[PDB]
Structure formats: C-alpha cells, structure tokens
A paper describes a structure:
The cysteine protease legumain can develop asparaginyl endopeptidase (AEP) and carboxypeptidase (ACP) activities in a pH- and context-dependent manner. Primarily found in endolysosomes, legumain is involved in immunological processes such as antigen processing and TLR maturation as well as in tumor progression.
The crystal structure of hCE revealed the typical five-stranded antiparallel β-sheet wrapped around a central α-helix. Parts of the appendix structure (Thr76–His82) were flexible in the electron density map. The legumain reactive center loop (RCL) of hCE exposed Asn39I in a conformation similar to that seen in hCC and hCF, consistent with its suggested role for active site (P1–S1) interaction.[4a] The conserved conformation of the RCL suggests a canonical, substrate-like binding mode that is shared within the type 2 cystatin family; differences in binding affinity within hCC/E/F should be related to exosite interactions. We considered Cys73I–Cys83I as one candidate for a legumain exosite loop (LEL) because it was stabilized relative to the reactive center loop (RCL) via charged interactions mediated by Lys75I to the P2 (Ser38I) and P1′ (Ser40I) carbonyls of the RCL.
Numbering used by the authors: 6 to 76, 83 to 125
The structure:
C-alpha cells in the first residue's frame, strides 16, 4: 500500500520522546492561545504514539498558568497562585517528522479545571 499507518501504542509518560513532544505542544499552545500568560505543563497523565510517515503523539496533560506574561525558558516561570491561578486539562496531538526540527501540534482541546 501507499499509506504508512502503524499500531497505536501506550507509552510511558516519562519517555524522553513523549517529553519532547509535550514541550512542543506547550510551546505551540502558548503561541496560539489568547491568554496573557504562558502556560506550563504540570503533569503528563497519558501518552500514546502511532507510527505514520513520521510519528504522532497523543498526549493528555495538565497545564498551569504562570506569572510570565508574553508581552522562552518556562522552567524559570512560577505557577500562578490565588487570583491568577488557572488549570487546564488538554488533549494534544503532536506530529514529529525527521526532516523538520520543529514538531507540530496538529490538534488540541483544552478544558478549564475547577
């Protein structure tokens, strides 16, 4: 066949390739979001991969708003507390291809947590 569609498989949330895919998702989400502040990953809850012509990562993760405003090393950005605190739970689909340096966030659906 012409198409390459591999098996969908569970990965460890601590797989270094999941982690890189996760930082790709965060960076892209922050670029596209209307929020004043950068969000930052707090927990990878679930991770799956699928071999295509390239690799898809399907990530479920939680994010927290930071004190860092956009107007980047997120490890230096504290999670906001009290009035500015906001938590999201997101599904991300990330595309990784060996000929591109930047991994792409194909889809995302985020949801504000109480």
């Amino acid at each position: 066949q012409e198409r390459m569609v591999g098996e969908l498989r569970d990965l460890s949330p601590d797989d270094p390739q999941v982690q890189k895919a996760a930082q790709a998702a965060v960076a892209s989400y922050n670029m596209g979001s209307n929020s004043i502040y950068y969000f930052r990953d707090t927990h990878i809850i679930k991770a799956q991969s699928q071999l295509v012509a390239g690799i898809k990562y399907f990530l479920t993760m939680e994010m927290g708003s930071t004190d860092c405003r956009k107007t980047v090393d997120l490890t230096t950005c504290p999670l906001a507390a009290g009035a500015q605190q906001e938590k999201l739970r997101c599904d991300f689909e990330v595309l990784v291809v060996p000929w591109q340096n930047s991994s792409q966030l194909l889809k995302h659906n985020c949801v504000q947590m109480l």
